[PDB]
Each structure stands twice: as structure tokens, then as C-alpha cells.
């Protein structure tokens, strides 16, 4: 049993017709202090998987090392390591899910919420969640922390059920994710303007975008707001 110290906030994601999108801001908070501004919380595994992590950053860095070691170990005595016997999103997820549940069962958890996004060998989209309790679930849209409360409602307006996935393009899906990140910057007190975004497509592969910023923000209406009720000046 511990408490989280340096933390990362929401990770958000969704499926679209040819793949998946995932995003997360670049902040490492220390309670109410916005301490570390250059923290990458999306970690690619090969060219077909991206693991997005929220929660304790020290435990994130530990998981990041486990994944790096997993790739090394998979290549051992494996001539098809870059082909048929490469790591799949489903393999990577089940491994983490196994680790998370085992750690909670020893009353010493990895204080994280994780979303594994990727595309399988057969072109199928993979998107599944796991957390410190070992709880797992899958949905067309997935989000952690505040994203669950604010992002999911917006992303579910695009993909409300399974049948909406083929009807959703990459441009529409990215637009929805970027909008959600803006909303989280308006409303989450432990968020940052700077974020990373990753697209895993079955045709165009893995596209990893860094140093993105929330833009097209609405603040001008603030000038007209005066006092808390009766004040006019």
C-alpha cells in the first residue's frame, strides 16, 4: 500500500474505421503543483501499439521499462520478431493486466490507469483499459480520470455504438479527440495545454505527434462577467 506522488491526469482514446487514436497531456503534477512540463505519457510498443498511462509517474516509468524489456525478450530466438511473431496489442495488454492484478493481490499496486491502443495482425482495432485494481473493460471510446467524465460523452456522440465505427473517418476522430483535450484544459485543474497524440492505422501505420497545443480557445466572454451577482462595475 502506498500513495501516488507525481501524477499524470486523463488519457483519452477512441476507435475509427481503419484504426484507433489515443492522446494524453505532457504534465507530471505534484499535488496542486504543476511540477514537470515535459513528461511523455504515451509509450509506443513496436509499430502497432501505443500504451497510454495515467496515475503515478514512478510506476509509469517502471511499466515503461517492463515494456522495453518485453520487446527485447520477444526478439530472443525469434526469426519472425519483425513479422508473424511480433508483439500484438492483445499480448501487451494481457501481460500488463496480469501484472496489475497480481500487484493488487499482494496489496502493493501499480497506482495507474492504462489504455492499450493498437491494431492487430488481421487489421482489427484493439482498445482496452486496465487499472490498479486489475479491472479491465473495452469500449469504442475509453478515457481515464477526468476524461471518463468529460471526454467520453463527447467521443460517444461520434461513436455511440459498434456500428458507428466504420462510419467514422480519421479526420473526424482526430477532430473529436483534439476538441476533448481542449475541454479538459478548460475544466481539469491538473491538466496542461501541451499534449501528445498517436494514431495507429491499419494502412498508414503508426503516426506519433508530439508538442501539440490546445488552440482556438474561447475566453473573450470573460470581460463581460463582473462580480458574483449584484456588482455592476
Amino acid at each position: 500500500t502506498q500513495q501516488p506522488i507525481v501524477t499524470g491526469t486523463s488519457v483519452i482514446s477512441m476507435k475509427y474505421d481503419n484504426g484507433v487514436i489515443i492522446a494524453a497531456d505532457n504534465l507530471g503534477s505534484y499535488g496542486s503543483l504543476l511540477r514537470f512540463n515535459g513528461v511523455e505519457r504515451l509509450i509506443p510498443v513496436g509499430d502497432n501499439t501505443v500504451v497510454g498511462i495515467s496515475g503515478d509517474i514512478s510506476d509509469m516509468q517502471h511499466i515503461e521499462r517492463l515494456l522495453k524489456d518485453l520487446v527485447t525478450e520477444n526478439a530472443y530466438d525469434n526469426p519472425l520478431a519483425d513479422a508473424e511473431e511480433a508483439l500484438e496489442p492483445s499480448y501487451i495488454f494481457e501481460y500488463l493486466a496480469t501484472v496489475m492484478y497480481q500487484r493488487r493481490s499482494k496489496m502493493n499496486p501499480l497506482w495507474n490507469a492504462i489504455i492499450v491502443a493498437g491494431v492487430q495482425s488481421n487489421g482489427d482495432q484493439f482498445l482496452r483499459y486496465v487499472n490498479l485494481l486489475g479491472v479491465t473493460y473495452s469500449s469504442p471510446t475509453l478515457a481515464t480520470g477526468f476524461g471518463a467524465h468529460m471526454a467520453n460523452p463527447l467521443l460517444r456522440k461520434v461513436v455511440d455504438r459498434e456500428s458507428d465505427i466504420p462510419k467514422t473517418t480519421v479526420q473526424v476522430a482526430e477532430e473529436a479527440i483534439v476538441n476533448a483535450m481542449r475541454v479538459l484544459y478548460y475544466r481539469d485543474a491538473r491538466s496542461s495545454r501541451n499534449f501528445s497524440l498517436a494514431i495507429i492505422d491499419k494502412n498508414t501505420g503508426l503516426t506519433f505527434k508530439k508538442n501539440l497545443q490546445v488552440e482556438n480557445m474561447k475566453w473573450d466572454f470573460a470581460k463581460d462577467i463582473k462580480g458574483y451577482g449584484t456588482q455592476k462595475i
Binding site: S29, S32, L33, L34, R190, W219, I225, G227, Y228, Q231
Partner: protein
Amino acid sequence: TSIMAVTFKDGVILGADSRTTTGAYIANRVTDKLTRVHDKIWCCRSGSAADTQAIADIVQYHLELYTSQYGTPSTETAASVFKELCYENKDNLTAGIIVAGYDDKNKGEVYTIPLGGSVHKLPYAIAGSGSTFIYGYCDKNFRENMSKEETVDFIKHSLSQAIKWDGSSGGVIRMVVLTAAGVERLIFYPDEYEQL
């Protein structure tokens, strides 16, 4: 919350962020924490929103009644009324208030009233959760008898840093200029102050 009041040559300027939080949720991102208790006596509010509103409303009532009987009250008098409420009800209140005002005789004055209900008259004052991160910056950069433009820049730069580091602070930077010329409201948006 990041609030400050700074005296300068022509008077005094109040400054504040616009963020109100319930834990990590931002309940209001365009809050007005600079509130008027008299024509040229304003206050900055930090702590409980309900407590500080209830106090400021009572003070505005007292000073309105003072004015009807004895004419325009001094900034010191306004600070005393705030103090009396904050001190006598210290067990039940969570309010950190900065009182700032302009007289023609006394010019610009700033009084800070922390949690206990004590009063401290200062050349400038900072308060709120975000003030912790700018004690060094403000102490190094503050000068007496600054110009209006210099003081606006000083507050802008200071609150910019407070917002950058404090999660409980954010949104727009509101300011209120108190001089003989009158009362001027200023606003500065994220795109402006973040790039400083």
C-alpha cells in the same frame, strides 16, 4: 487562487486569476475575485467562495451605511470592518482577503488580512495558494513609486508565474486600477500572458 494588490505612484492596482475549483474540477473558469465594497475601495478574495462573498456583502453594507452618515470612509476603516468579521468569526471562516483603496489624502493603500484575522498594511501584498510560488519573484522585482505601465507588467508577470505552477489558479488575469482619474478594469487572456 492567485491574488495581489500593488501600490504605485498614481494609486493602487488589484490583480487576480479567474479559477474556482471543487477539488480538481474547475467549477468556474471566468470568476471575478476582484470585488467592490466602495467606489474606490476594492478587495481581492481567496479561500471559501461562500465565506468571502458573505463577508464582502456585509462590508459593502457597513460602508454604504457609514457613507450615508459620515461621508466617504478611508481604506483603513474598510480594512478594519473586514478584520472585525474575520477575527471574531475565525473559528467558522476560511477567508484570505486583500483590501486596496485610493484616497486623495492617503493615495494608494494596501492591507492584507490572512486566516487569523490579523491586519498588515503593506506597499504590496500577495495571497492565495498560488502566491507561494512568486514570493521570490515579487520580492526581487517590486519597486516603490512605479508607473501604471510598470505596475501592470509587474502584476501580469507575477500572476502569470503563479498560474503556471499552481493548479488552483488559472483562466484570465483580471485587474482593477484605482487612481484619482477613476476606476479602470483590465483583462489579459492566456495567449497573452503565457508567452511571457
